Amino acid sequence: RPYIKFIAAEDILNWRERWVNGAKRTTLLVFREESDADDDGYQIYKEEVWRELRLVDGTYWQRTWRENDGQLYVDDWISPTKADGSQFDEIPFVIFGSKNN
Amino acid sequence: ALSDLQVFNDWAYKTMSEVLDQQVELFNGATRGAIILRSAGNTGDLSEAAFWA
Amino acid sequence: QEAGAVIGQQLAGDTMQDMLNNGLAAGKAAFTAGGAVHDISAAGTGLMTQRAFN
Amino acid sequence: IIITDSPALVSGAAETLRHSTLGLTTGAILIEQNQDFDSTVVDGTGKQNITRQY
Amino acid sequence: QVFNDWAYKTMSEVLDQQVELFNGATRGAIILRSAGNTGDLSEAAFWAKIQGLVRPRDPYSNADVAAKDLRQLVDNTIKVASGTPPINIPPSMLRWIQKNPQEAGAVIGQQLAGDTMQDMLNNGLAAGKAAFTAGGAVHDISAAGTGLMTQRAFNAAQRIFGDRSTDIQVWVSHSSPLFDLYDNALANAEQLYVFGTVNVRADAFGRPIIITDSPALVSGAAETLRHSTLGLTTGAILIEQNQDFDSTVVDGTGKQNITRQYQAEWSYNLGVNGYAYDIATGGKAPNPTALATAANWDKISTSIKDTGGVVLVTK
Amino acid sequence: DSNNIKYVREDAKKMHKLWAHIRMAMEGSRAIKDNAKEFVPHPDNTKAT
Amino acid sequence: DSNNIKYVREDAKKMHKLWAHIRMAMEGSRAIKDNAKEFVPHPDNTKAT
């Protein structure tokens, strides 16, 4: 199943606008994902998850950053694909606002 | 010989900071409620509430 | 930005650390003030035992 | 039994270190974080390099 | 994004030296790529040329057998740190004749872009001159005739650079040598000029002359005044920023005024083709005098033809 | 102040104060007159002593 | 560089103060009073010391 998330305006951390063949493209996009880890002990801490979305040569890639004990973990790049395939040419993320998207 | 080459020692900034020493994850449910951690604000330095003896 | 982040996470740890420490110290002091003190070193060798709990 | 290496529970050294253990009840110790957090970053000029403080 | 854009009245004198001398304007001789890098150095290693790779042989006599070994050279790229002095933005006092003093931030920004361009160009030119002096590729013309020749001076520099002289395609110079060249062109002792072609900026070999008034190419005064023009190969001088510009504005309210102070830092890497910076002899963070000082630059490439650049000195 | 710096801010311990205030406001004049102090500060603490 | 995952764009960081102001106005009055020193200037800072 696919899911549609809502990202708070404070949770968008980074973005880029590089023109490929003169086309306004969002290449980099990093947002903070917040969650309480399903564990046994009472975690008074907030578990913070950083999602990195990138666009290379017209292909959508993403990976997840997770921290623990001050460590930082990096997951392998995964290129999600449509039902037929062909991966993507743009990042599936929109930043809606009062002026324009 | 290996002396002729220029040996480069690998390095990396893993930026992996230390946190602390003792464990402080014992609040509310963790202590069955013995130690309670709230997030309430108060005025002055004292917050007293009387009750009947 | 990264100096601020490092200070933030170390501060997140240390704030809980000193908050709990002060809480425990205040609890011990209040219990000493209230007379609910029981020492076990005066009864033989002083080491923790189930009898001390009782 | 909750384990904690808090310096509020040791109070001594050598042959006079006196470990203190607490038997608590529900809501025995209350801690409220007054959410009055204030953090400033201040910077200075007139040097070879900019100096910041936190 | 700027709070105030620059108006007609705010025609702050931008600069007095042409500083568009990068890549296409200089045919790639001085590049200004952008690549951030850590530390105070960025060195790379490449295999050296074996001297006696091919040797004479005597098949009839076994005799002895020689032994040969292959080494590794080390390219280098020093990092030069620069900054801006603390700037006293007027505290709303420069107002009787000026429209407003709050546009100090914008005027500083624009003049600072211009001045960082000139600073990078000057440091690159001074480092190139010092390195080429260290490499033994300097031609001096101060005792021969007036001091500058029309094209016979350039031919000496290409003579020094050697059989591979063809790859030098750019001359950078002060304006005074160019005006002397025009004077001798407008006064053709050897009748090889016509009025239509007396304004040529080339050097009779297809190498254009690019003119800038950087103080790194002029020194002394009167009889001690020497102009240094240096011919560059393709990508001879490398200037790389680290895209780490910093700024701050501090109101030191206590010291008799709020005293808006403006600070800035930025660092760039500088490296000359075929040469390395002697950090042990120099410093971790060299100053423009340290860059311009010979024996702080060490030649790496064995052949002078591989080292890119030659300095021509005329009075 | 930097919200990207870690902070835990979700539990009813956050909201008991205003929930209780809402409850006594819903109760009526009895509770409000009863718990007067947090709503009506003393005109002067020196007199209050 | 150096994989600074927690980096925040400068314009968003600049707008964070106004975002916090708007969110605190959305919060109610307790957030404003708990942060009143940055909204209501002291009538005299000499006393505030």
Token pair belonging to B38: 């709230």
Q: How far is CA E36 from CA E39, E143, E208, E245, in A?
A: 10, 46, 32, 11
How close, in Å, is residue B51 to chain G by CA atoms? 26
Backbone angles phi, psi at E49, to 5 degrees: -80, 125
Three-state SS at A74: strand
Q: At A97, is the secondary structure helix, strand, or coil?
A: coil
Beta strands E226-232; E310-314: pairing state: antiparallel
Contact list, C16 vs chain B (CB under 8 Å): 24
Nearest chain B residue to A72 by CA: give it: B16
Nearest-CA distance C52 → chain G (Å): 47
Question: What is the pairing mode between strands E209-211 and E170-173?
Answer: parallel
Residue at token pair 């990068």: E22
Chains A & C: contacts with CB separation below 8 Å? 3
F7, A46: Cβ pair inside 8 Å?
yes
Q: Looking at chain B, which residue has its C-alpha nearest residue A46? A: B25
Resolution of the structure in the document, Å:
3.7
* Cβ-based contacts of B39 with chain F (< 8 Å): 9, 11, 13-14
User: How many angstroms from the chain centroid is the CA of residue G2?
Assistant: 30
B18: left (phi over 0), alpha (psi -120 to 50) or beta: beta
Partner-chain contact D37 F1, CB within 8 Å: yes
User: Does residue A44 contact residue F8 with C-beta atoms inside 8 Å?
Assistant: yes
* Interchain CB distance below 8 Å, C5 and G8: no
Separation of alpha carbons E301 and E308, rounded Å:
10
Tokens encoding E211: 């003119």
- Supply C49's token pair: 């035992």
- Residues of G in Cβ contact (< 8 Å) with E36: 1
Q: Using an 8 Å Cβ cutoff, are G18 and G26 in contact?
A: no
Return phi, psi of residue E153, to 5°: -75, -45
DSSP string, chain E: --SS---SS------SS----SGGGGTTSEE--B----SSB--EEEEPPPTTSS----TT-----------EEEE--EEEEEEEEEEE---S---SSSS-STTHHHHHHHHHHHHHHHHHHHHHHHHHHHHHHHTT-EEEESSSTTS--SSHHHHHHHHHH-TTGGG--EEEE-HHHHHHHHHHHSS-SSS---GGGTT--S-SSS--EEE---GGGEES-GGG-EEEEEEE-TT-EEEEE-S--EEEEE--TTTTS---EEEEEEEEEEEETTEEE-TTTS-SS--HHHHHSTTSEEE-SSSTTTS--EEEEE-
Beta-carbon separation of F4 and C9 below 8 A? no
Residue D17's contacts (CB-CB under 8 Å, 6 or more residues apart) are D10, D11
Indicate the residue type of E26: T
Q: Which residues of C touch B19 (CB under 8 A)?
A: 9-10, 13
A36 close to B (CB below 8 A): no
- Asked if A12 and A31 touch (Cβ cutoff 8 Å), the reply is yes
With beta carbons less than 8 A apart as the criterion, state whether E150 and E46 touch: no
Other C-beta atoms lying within 10 Å of the C-beta of residue F43: 8
Which residue in this structure is represented by tokens 């053709």?
A: E188
Identity of the residue in B4, B8, B13 whose CB atom sits nearest the CB atom of E71: B4
Report the candidate in E135, E189, E145 with the shortest Cα–Cα distance to residue E305: E135
Residues of A in contact with C16 (CB under 8 A): 44
* Location of structure tokens 């023109």: A19
Solving technique for this entry?
Answer: cryo-EM
Q: How many residues are present in chain F? A: 49
Which site among G1, G2, G6 would you substitute to test the C interface, given the most C Cβ atoms closer than 10 Å to its Cβ?
G6
Please name the member of G6, G20, G30 whose beta carbon is closest to the beta carbon of F4. G6
Sign of CA dihedral E182, E186, E192, E198: positive
Tell me how many residue pairs between chain C and chain D have CB atoms under 8 A apart: 36
Beta strands E246-250; E237-241: pairing state: unpaired
